[PDB]
Amino acid sequence: DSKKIVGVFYKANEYATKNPNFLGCVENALGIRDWLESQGHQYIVTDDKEGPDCELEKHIPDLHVLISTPFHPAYVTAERIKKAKNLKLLLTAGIGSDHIDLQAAAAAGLTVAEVTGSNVVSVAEDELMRILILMRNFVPGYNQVVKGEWNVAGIAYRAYDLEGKTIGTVGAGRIGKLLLQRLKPFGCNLLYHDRLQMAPELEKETGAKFVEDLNEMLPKCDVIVINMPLTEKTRGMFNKELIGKLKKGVLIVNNARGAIMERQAVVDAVESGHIGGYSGDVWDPQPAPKDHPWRYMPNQAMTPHTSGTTIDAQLRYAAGTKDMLERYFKGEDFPTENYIVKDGELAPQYR
Amino acid sequence: DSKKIVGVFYKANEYATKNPNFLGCVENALGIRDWLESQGHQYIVTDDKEGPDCELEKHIPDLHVLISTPFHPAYVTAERIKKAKNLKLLLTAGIGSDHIDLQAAAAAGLTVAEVTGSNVVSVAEDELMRILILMRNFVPGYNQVVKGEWNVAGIAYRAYDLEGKTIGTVGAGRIGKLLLQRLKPFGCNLLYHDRLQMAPELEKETGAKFVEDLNEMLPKCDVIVINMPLTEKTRGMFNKELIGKLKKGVLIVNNARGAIMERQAVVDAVESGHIGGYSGDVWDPQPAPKDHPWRYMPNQAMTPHTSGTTIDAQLRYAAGTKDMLERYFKGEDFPTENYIVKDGELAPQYR
C-alpha cells in the first residue's frame, strides 16, 4: 500500500550542494527519495513547518509518516495529531522526541521511534576534543592568529598537557564509556561517577576508577566532563556552591545539557577565574539567543549544538530511518530500543 | 667553585604572576634561583639580549653558563663566544640549538646540551587535538558563538567524526608513535610512513599499518599529519603537485616545520577547497609576521608556536636544566642524548 511520507528538515541551501552527504536537510532529504519513490510512496519534504498556512499543515491531514530531526523539528501537538487522519508513524532521524506530545501520540495509537545510540561516538569524540582544546589552550592561540598577534606568553601561561591530569566524568553511560576508552592512552588519572560501576575489566582497560561519592570526586578534577541527563537532581546542580568546591582553574566540558549548569553561576565563576574554561555545545535556552552570556564570557570554547549532526551521525540517522521505514512497510517490528511509543503504548521510561 | 649563570628568557610580565609555574620567563627563571644562590652561584636573568649595549653583553665576558630557550633565544655567535672568557656551558631549556653556532662552540671547547625528548607528549597531544578540531569542524562553530550566530548547517556540512577515517602520519618517530597510541581507540584506519617500521607488537597495539611508498599512502588519507624533520628532501615537499594528489578535502596537521609545506601552495589549495583544512603551530617565517597568509586563509586552525611550551613541558625543561647544572657543578656527564657538543666535540648527527 502506497504511503505518504513527509519529512521536515531545514534548508541547507548551498551547503547541501557543497556536501551531498549532508542528508539532514530538505535538499538531500535523508537520501531516501529515490528509494521511497521506487516503492510507489509519496515523499513530501519541507522546511515550512510553523503556522496554519505552512506547507506541513497541508499534509498533516493525510500523511502516514512524519519524519523530522531535532534540528528543525516538526512539532507534533495533540492538535495536529487530531487533524491527521492517516498518521501512524513518527520517526526522528536522530535522537530526541521532545518536540512530540508522546501522551497524545500514544492516545492516538501512534508509533514513535528514533535512531537510538547513533550519536554516541560523535559526542564522545567531541568531548575529548574539548578536553584538549581547553587543557592545551587552543582558543587564545587561534584568536591571536586571526588578529595578527604573536604572544606566546599569553597562551603558554594557561596551556598544559593532558597527560597526568585528573579527568572526571559525571555519568558514564555509553558516551562516558567511549570517552574513557579514548582517554586511556593519554596517561591521565581517570575518575568516573555513575549510578552503575563499569565491569572491572572495562575499568582496568580504561584505567578509570569509580568514585561513589560525587562530592568526593569533583574537587579532585582538573577536568570535569558532564555526561548525565537533565533531571530534577541534575538541573542547576553546578551552582555557585558546587562550582566553589571545584579546583580553582577547573576546566568543564558539557555536551550533555546546558541546564545542568546554573547559567549565571558559570559566568560568575568564569569571570572570577575559578572555572578556568568551559566548553560545550549545549545551551539554555537552545538555540542560544544572540545575547547568550556563555558566548561572550572569558575563556569560553563553545559551539552551537552540532556534535551529533556530523555527517557520519547523519548517515547513521538516515540509515536507521530507512531501516524503520522498510520495517514499517513490511509490518516488522523495529529494534526495541528505538521505540518511544509502539502502537499506542508509551515505553515505560517515558511514562 | 662559584659560577656565574646567565639565563635569557622573555618577560612574561603579568602572566608570570598569574602562573608561577610558568618557569620559562624572566620572572620565574626556571624555578632554579633559590637553588643556584644557595649553592653560592650568581644567577643573572635578563630578556635584554640584542645589541652591543644590552644586559646580556655585560655578562658575556665572564659568565660560565648561558641558558636560553628557543622562544627568546640568546644567539651564541662566534663573535660572542670569542668575547666570553669563562663560558663553558650552553644549555637550552627546551629543545632546539639553532640559535648557537655549533662549530664555533666546538672550536672553543664548549659543551652544548638540551633537554632531549621533553616535548614529545606535548606535541603528540597537540596533533591529536588538531585532528579533531579539523575533522569535527570546531573553528567555524567557535566563530559563530562569538559573532552571535547560530547556523548549524554552516558547521555540519564540513563536520565529520574521526571514527572510520584514514589518518596517515608522515614520519613516526617518538611524536608519531605517541600520536598513533592516542589515535588507537578512535577506531580509525591508521597508516604510517617512516624510514623505520615500528615493532609488530606496537603496530598490533596501535593498529597502524606501515606504508613504504609515501605516494601510495598520501592519497588514501582523510587526515595527513606531518611528523618529519625539515631536510633538503622534505623542504617544500608539499607543493602544488603533491597537494594535488591528496584527496580533495584532505585535512593536514603540521606541528613539525612550516617549510615542509610550500607556503603559497597550501594557500592556493585551501582557497580551492582541495585542502579542507590546515592546522599547526609552525610557520615560515617564525615568528609569523602579522601578514602571514596562513593567518587569513580559509579553514585555517593555526596557533602561534606554543605546543612545546605548555606548563608541563616547561617543568620538564626546567628540571632537565637543573639536572644538567647540578651535573656540571659536580663534574658528571649529562645524559648522552642531551649533548649537542661535549667538551668541544660536536655529536656526529650535528657535523
Gap between the Cα atoms of B166 and B191, Å rounded: 7
Nearest residue on chain A to B72, alpha-carbon basis: A152
The count of C-alpha atoms lying within 13 angstroms of the C-alpha of B103, restricted to the half-sphere facing its C-beta, is 1
**B137 inside 8 A of chain A by CB:** yes
Fold match flag (A1-118+310-351 vs A119-309): yes
Residue A12 has its nearest CB partner, among B153, B288, B296, at B153
Distance from CA of A241 to the nearest CA of B (A): 24
Question: What one-letter code names the amino acid at A178?
Answer: L
Q: CB-based burial of residue A323 (10 Å sphere; 0-12 exposed, 13-18 middle, 19+ buried)?
A: middle
**CA-CA distances (angstroms) from residue B110 to B8, B75, B95, B325, B346?**
18, 15, 18, 14, 9
Give, to the nearest 10 degrees, the angle between helix A120-136 and helix A174-183.
50
**A156 inside 8 A of chain B by CB:** yes
Angle (CA) B245 B247 B248, round 5°:
105
Residue B310 has its nearest CB partner, among A15, A161, A313, at A161
The answer to whether B312 and B122 have CB atoms below 8 angstroms apart is yes
Chain A residues in contact with B176 (beta carbon < 8 A): none
A158 is catalytic: no
- What is the residue whose three cell numbers read 623505520? B196
The answer to whether A155 and A299 have CB atoms below 8 angstroms apart is no
Q: How far is CA A15 from the centre of its chain?
A: 21
The three-class DSSP label of residue A198 is coil
**CA-CA distances (angstroms) from residue B164 to A121, B6, B135?**
11, 51, 11
Sheet containing B275-280: order of strands: B209-210, B189-193, B166-170, B223-226, B250-254, B275-280
Q: Determine, for residues A160 and B16 on separate chains, whether the beta-carbon distance falls below 8 Å.
A: no
Smallest Cα–Cα separation from A26: which of B137, B153, B140? B153
The answer to whether A89 and A64 have CB atoms below 8 angstroms apart is yes
A286 is catalytic: yes
The answer to whether A290 and B148 have CB atoms below 8 angstroms apart is yes
Question: What one-letter code names the amino acid at A267?
Answer: V
Grid coordinates belonging to A279: 566548553
> What radius of gyration, in Å, describes the C-alpha atoms of chain B?
22
Within 8 A by CB and 6+ apart from A149, the residues are: A143, B290, B304
The three-class DSSP label of residue B43 is strand
Smallest Cα–Cα separation from B162: which of B137, B179, B181, B198? B137
Element housing A215 (H / E)? helix A214-220
Active site (catalytic) residues of B = 119, 257, 286, 305
The answer to whether B131 and A138 have CB atoms below 8 angstroms apart is no
Gap between the Cα atoms of A324 and A332, Å rounded: 9
E-strand spans in chain B? Answer: 4-8, 42-46, 65-68, 89-92, 111-114, 166-170, 189-193, 209-210, 223-226, 250-254, 275-280, 339-342, 345-346
Grid coordinates belonging to B103: 662549530
The three-class DSSP label of residue A342 is strand
Interface size between A and B, measured as CB pairs under 8 A: 207
The three-class DSSP label of residue B105 is helix
Element housing A226 (H / E)? strand A223-226
Q: CB-based burial of residue B210 (10 Å sphere; 0-12 exposed, 13-18 middle, 19+ buried)?
A: middle
- Residue A339 pairs in a beta bridge with A113
The answer to whether B132 and A132 have CB atoms below 8 angstroms apart is yes
Gap between the Cα atoms of A313 and A125, Å rounded: 12
Q: CB-based burial of residue B212 (10 Å sphere; 0-12 exposed, 13-18 middle, 19+ buried)?
A: exposed
Burial B11-31 (b: 16+ CB within 10 A, else e): bbeebbeebeebbbbbbbbbb
Grid coordinates belonging to A234: 541534575
Element housing A200 (H / E)? helix A200-206
Gap between the Cα atoms of A194 and A206, Å rounded: 15
The answer to whether B163 and B187 have CB atoms below 8 angstroms apart is yes
Which of A21, A292, A310 would best serve as a mutation to test chain B binding (most B beta carbons within 10 A)? Answer: A310
CB atoms within 10 A of CB A230: 17
- Residue A100 pairs in a beta bridge with A76
Element housing A13 (H / E)? none
**B13 inside 8 A of chain A by CB:** yes
Beta strands B339-342 and B111-114, pairing class: antiparallel
Q: How far is CA B58 from the centre of its chain?
A: 30
Nearest residue on chain A to B305, alpha-carbon basis: A152
Range A1-118+310-351: architecture per CATH: 3-Layer(aba) Sandwich (3.40)
Fold of B119-309: Rossmann fold (3.40.50)
Cα-based torsion angle of the residue sequence A168, A169, A172, A178 in order, rounded to the nearest 10 degrees = -90
Gap between the Cα atoms of A131 and A133, Å rounded: 6
The count of C-alpha atoms lying within 13 angstroms of the C-alpha of A328, restricted to the half-sphere facing its C-beta, is 30
Gap between the Cα atoms of A201 and A304, Å rounded: 36
Domain-wise residue ranges, chain B: 1-118+310-351, 119-309
Could you write out the DSSP letters of every residue in A66-120?
A: EEE-TTS---B-HHHHHH-SS--EEEESSS--TTB-HHHHHHTT-EEEE-TTTTH
The answer to whether A312 and A24 have CB atoms below 8 angstroms apart is no
Grid coordinates belonging to B299: 579553514
Q: How far is CA A157 from the centre of its chain?
A: 32
3-state secondary structure A145-165: HHHCCCCCHHHHCCCCCCCCC
DSSP-derived secondary structure letter, B199: P
Could you write out the DSSP letters of every residue in A253-314?
A: EE-S-GGGB-HHHHHHHHHTTSEEEEEES--SSSSPPTT-GGGTSTTB----S-TT-SHHHH
Gap between the Cα atoms of B21 and B25, Å rounded: 10
Distance from CA of B291 to the nearest CA of A (A): 7
Backbone angles phi, psi at A162, to 5 degrees: -75, -35
Element housing A36 (H / E)? helix A33-38
Backbone angles phi, psi at B63, to 5 degrees: -70, 155
Of the candidates A99, A193, A257, A263, the residue annotated as catalytic is: A257
Smallest Cα–Cα separation from B340: which of B125, B156, B90, B63? B90
Grid coordinates belonging to B13: 610580565
Which of B22, B26, B118, B129 would best serve as a mutation to test chain A binding (most A beta carbons within 10 A)? Answer: B129
Within 8 A by CB and 6+ apart from A1, the residues are: none
Way it was determined? X-ray
